[PDB]
Design a protein around this motif. Structure first.
Motif, PDB file in Angstrom:
ATOM      1  N   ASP A   1       0.837  -1.189   0.000  1.00  0.00           N
ATOM      2  CA  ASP A   1       0.000   0.000   0.000  1.00  0.00           C
ATOM      3  C   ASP A   1       0.877   1.245   0.000  1.00  0.00           C
TER       4      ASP A   1
ATOM      5  N   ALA B   1       1.162  -3.105   5.095  1.00  0.00           N
ATOM      6  CA  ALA B   1      -0.236  -2.999   5.505  1.00  0.00           C
ATOM      7  C   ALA B   1      -0.454  -2.221   6.795  1.00  0.00           C
TER       8      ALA B   1
ATOM      9  N   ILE C   1      -3.264  -9.194   8.438  1.00  0.00           N
ATOM     10  CA  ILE C   1      -4.070  -8.923   7.251  1.00  0.00           C
ATOM     11  C   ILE C   1      -5.563  -8.977   7.545  1.00  0.00           C
TER      12      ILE C   1
ATOM     13  N   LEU D   1      -7.080  -5.544   7.305  1.00  0.00           N
ATOM     14  CA  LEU D   1      -7.242  -5.035   5.947  1.00  0.00           C
ATOM     15  C   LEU D   1      -8.478  -5.620   5.280  1.00  0.00           C
TER      16      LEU D   1
END
Ligand code: GTP
Ligand code: GTP
Lengths: 427, 99, 149, 427
Positions: A203, A302, A374, A377
């Motif tokens: 990102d 992330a 994760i 996210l």
């Protein structure tokens, strides 16, 4: 021999691929004109992992760009190294996607997938036996997901025995300027998690953060951000191209880093970020290298892995080290946080060490880690999907395109299963 | 010097300059080479106001070598030992961009 | 700073304060140089050029230098464009002046002309890609337009 | 090895550390830039105690600069050697302290403590093993006191086996400009005595007195004030970094120095002070060395011990001495005034000799004496606190922070308890 083929999709790809290929060209000391000015015997030795060769010396890349916007490829050809790209390889279309995933997945692909498959197979017969293909696409980028899902789905059963490296930029948790981005992301990630073997998820927010942490040049250029990410990705590739006591194979890496079939999404980690004073003011050594290397800030993908725990970590090193110091560093960090690994799997470290350092710097590395960082996210993107499918606003474009809501339901079901699956294996 | 500069007495609980960089060998040679560096950089920044490839050798290489040096396949019809040895010289003439 | 390992060249501004003979060193924070937002390098103050050798009775271990020790300070008479000058273990090249400066010197210190010297760095130009010659199968004028981009 | 990392806090402590660092670099021979001119084998032999090592023959201090005010840090960096400290350690903020200890201790604490802890611990695991840290600040200084409170209170627990040396300058018995100074000072000292172990107390009035006494140059600067105090603690630290026969461990000194835990505060004294003609009019004889050492004029911390009585005295010498003369001089002084050394424990003298003369003068030394001569200080400051607590003037700012007067009450209770046992142990 063994070789790789590169695919450049979406304008994120059109970005990266250009910057990345010129980075590797500078690494192997190829001039923009494409005629070698010999400096390194060994880079002559192993230029063949990526570059084919033509009468007259020129060094073509084994990559194919693909998009739907003629202006962007015009611009990249206007770039410094466009002459290092082939008119035959330039596969494209007559239309603009409108950045709609279903447009990229059902209608516009029907007049380009054939040509791109023809290109890839002619290149495959040109080469001997690929280790596989790598792809630069954006999971929320308009054209990228639409083209990529189709092409990867086809190439899977075309070649069921290779390595499909997938590299994507994650939508910012705060800024996109694309409003159907959640829809595109979910639809794409369904087939992505079905098919792929390995995916790097990156990102730009952490890129901006690291810009204000160590770049310290205030306003950056997206090209410079591309420099950073391409540095990461060249680095992860460096195992194949060089001699030295290491274990190059990405397949080594996969079996070393993957505990179950349904884990693919990993978070890059880079090595020293040097700034204005630090060029005179850093003692480049293994200890500080390890310290800054496993810093919760110098990771860039992330979010903080703090809330979760690490499952597997692999470190590629580059330079004239000795394995004793890396061993002791690994043991020391292991004891420093023996709380934040898992008793489930002990000694979760993998090491590769190459002796051919990058140019302009001596002692460096690259990091890869699969942790449980994760959930948040794909969590956030899932709840945004809930909030916007609640009233199915903007649905008319996709309905007229000709897709159906059962696909949305199935994709969100798969994502929920991913959330759970992550949760139980560490909690 | 005083006693010895080539060596600094094994188990030297004191330290030396030039700890990083060239390192990873036995002790005494490291001492010699490191102090050589310590006077090299010394005079280099002194500089008072200046403004005021065994991979291939003679007879080519062994069979079954991989790694593309320029050409070969474009030229052919000779014993690989020859081919390599003749490339060893024509890498100076037409593909002379090999250094 | 090319003598050092990772050194480079920069440019700064010297303000001779007449009214107290003090000196200073400015800085050029243009943009995107990595360098930290920081105005000065050395503050406006006095500078001891040449000293005596018997400051054992007056060691730097005690009160720093003063009237009792200095042989001579850096006079305004010393700054000349076209010769390096050394300070705090650094030696500088002065290249440019200002019209006011070069007219002040021509009468007060009685100084002739010293033109500035181009201290810049230059490079040659590259050349455009030409046409792979007439293949024999095309047109010597249309194939040009065809084989461009 | 076994080393130290420095802490400087407070706007005065900024000047203090600047002068002290430049003195260290001056005596070790490092040039203005940092590429040292090899002349002295021993000062090359023992620099890893303070300086760390990077490329290019440079030697960074392991000092961390903490501040709130941009101008002060800008000036100190602009000084003669600011290029020797690191932007890494140039941790700062944007809000004025307001010279309000409550502001500096609670509201501005949280947003700094994290970063400062980050930097200090990074340096910590960078090094091998501390003896501890010296923290130079001002209990009379707002930012210094406020930040020092939190930093010491946290630094206690994590590494409780090291030595948290403290330097602070006591407010002037004649003027402070700052009028909330007594409140700030007590709010600092209450946790100073609770946490730390050794404190050097100093006052500026005695510095001005000595300026009239022997410095005589009638135009002094706080630069010269820093110069002399830097000489003092440089002298106390001289023992570690040189060959010779003496104990160097500050822990040796502390266990030799402090009988009871609650006593922590000590009065230093320095060795020959000289005037323009005396620099060659003076007889460098160990007898007159001892004389001018013990003379009350030469003291510069608080006041004349002639009111009070000594508990422990330790003098450390530097130069080409021998044992017997300092021994017999101790004999002479003890006999001369044996009725002023407490019946509690005789032999209260502690000696040690380093054999490397300072550059510029051969015979030198430094002295620290814990004596019951601070009653004047704390008695007076206690009456000031009481007489400005009678009617709680200048207290609305503190209420706006959200404090309560009880903390003041118990701090004063602790301070008076110290007063009582101070008087009792020798009376
Ligand atoms: N080269 C380049 N790429 C950028 C830049 N800024 C952002 N990008 C990224 O490129 C992403 C999309 O790339 P693609 O995969 O090519 O998207 P697409 O399907 O072709 O079409 P769109 O997403 O609508 O732009 C955006 O989401 C951005 O995050 C930039 O300044 N230059
Ligand atoms: N540097 C310096 N400090 C002085 C001098 N005279 C008195 N001081 C005192 O030393 C104190 C210590 O400075 P700091 O600890 O940085 O003070 P602060 O936390 O910023 O808050 P204030 O004390 O209100 O300025 C100063 O506040 C002054 O009160 C002097 O001549 N020079």
């Amino acid at each position: 021999m063994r070789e790789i083929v590169h695919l450049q999709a979406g304008q994120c790809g059109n970005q990266i691929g250009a910057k990345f290929w010129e980075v590797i060209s500078d690494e192997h000391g190829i001039d923009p004109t494409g005629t070698y000015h010999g400096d390194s015997d060994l880079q002559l030795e192993r230029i063949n992992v990526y570059y084919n060769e033509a009468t007259g010396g020129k060094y073509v890349p084994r990559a194919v760009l693909v998009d739907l916007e003629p202006g962007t490829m015009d611009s990249v050809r206007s770039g410094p190294f466009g002459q290092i790209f082939r008119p035959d390889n330039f596969v494209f279309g007559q239309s603009g996607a409108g950045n709609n995933w279903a447009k990229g997945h059902y209608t516009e692909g029907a007049e380009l997938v054939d040509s791109v498959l023809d290109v890839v197979r002619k290149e495959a017969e040109s080469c001997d036996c690929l280790q596989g293909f790598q792809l630069t696409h954006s999971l929320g980028g308009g054209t990228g997901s639409g083209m990529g899902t189709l092409l990867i789905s086809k190439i899977r059963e075309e070649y069921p025995d290779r390595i499909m490296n997938t590299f994507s930029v994650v939508p910012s948790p705060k800024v996109s300027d694309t409003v159907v981005e959640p829809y595109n992301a979910t639809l794409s990630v369904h087939q992505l998690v079905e098919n792929t073997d390995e995916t790097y998820c990156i990102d730009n927010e952490a890129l901006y953060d690291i810009c204000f942490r160590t770049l310290k040049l205030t306003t950056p250029t997206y090209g410079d951000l591309n420099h950073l990410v391409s540095a990461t990705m060249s680095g992860v590739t460096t195992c194949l191209r060089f001699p030295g006591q290491l274990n190059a194979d990405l397949r080594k890496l996969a079996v070393n880093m993957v505990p179950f079939p349904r884990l693919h999404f990993f978070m890059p980690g880079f090595a020293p970020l040097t700034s204005r004073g630090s060029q005179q003011y850093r003692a480049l050594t293994v200890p500080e290298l390890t310290q800054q290397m496993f810093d919760a800030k110098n990771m860039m993908a992330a979010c903080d892995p703090r809330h979760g725990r690490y499952l597997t970590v692999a470190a590629v090193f580059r330079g004239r080290m000795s394995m004793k110091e890396v061993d002791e560093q690994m043991l020391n960090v292991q004891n420093k946080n023996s709380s934040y690994f898992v008793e489930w799997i002990p000694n979760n470290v993998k090491t590769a060490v190459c002796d051919i350092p990058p140019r302009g710097l001596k002692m460096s590395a690259t990091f890869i880690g699969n942790s449980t960082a994760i959930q948040e996210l794909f969590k956030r993107i899932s709840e945004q999907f809930t909030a916007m499918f609640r009233r199915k606003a903007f649905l008319h474009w996709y309905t007229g395109e000709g897709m159906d809501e059962m696909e949305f339901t199935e994709a969100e079901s798969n994502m929920n299963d991913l959330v759970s699956e992550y949760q139980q294996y560490q909690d | 010097p005083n006693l010895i500069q080539r060596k600094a007495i094994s188990g030297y609980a004191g330290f030396v300059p030039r700890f990083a960089w060239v390192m990873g060998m036995n002790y005494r040679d490291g001492v010699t080479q490191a102090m050589d560096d310590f006077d090299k950089n010394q005079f280099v920044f002194r500089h008072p106001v200046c403004a005021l490839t065994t991979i291939y050798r003679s007879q080519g290489l062994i069979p079954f070598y991989m790694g593309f040096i320029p050409s070969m396949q474009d030229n052919y019809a000779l014993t690989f030992g020859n081919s390599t040895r003749r490339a060893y010289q024509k890498e100076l003439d037409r593909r002379s961009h090999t250094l | 700073d090319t003598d050092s390992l990772f050194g480079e060249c920069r440019h700064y501004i010297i303000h001779y304060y007449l009214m107290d003979d003090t000196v200073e060193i400015r800085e050029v924070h243009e943009r995107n140089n990595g360098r930290d937002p920081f105005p000065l390098l050395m503050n406006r103050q006095r500078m001891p050029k040449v000293l005596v050798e018997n400051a054992k009775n007056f060691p730097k271990c005690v009160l720093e230098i003063s009237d009792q020790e200095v042989l001579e300070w850096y006079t305004a008479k010393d700054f000349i464009v076209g010769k390096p000058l050394t300070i705090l273990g650094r030696t500088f090249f002065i290249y440019d002046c200002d019209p006011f400066t070069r007219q002040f010197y021509k009468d007060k210190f009685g100084m002739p002309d010293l033109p500035p010297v181009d201290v810049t760095k230059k490079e040659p130009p590259p050349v455009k890609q030409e046409l792979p010659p007439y293949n024999g199968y095309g047109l010597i004028e249309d194939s040009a337009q065809n084989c461009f981009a």
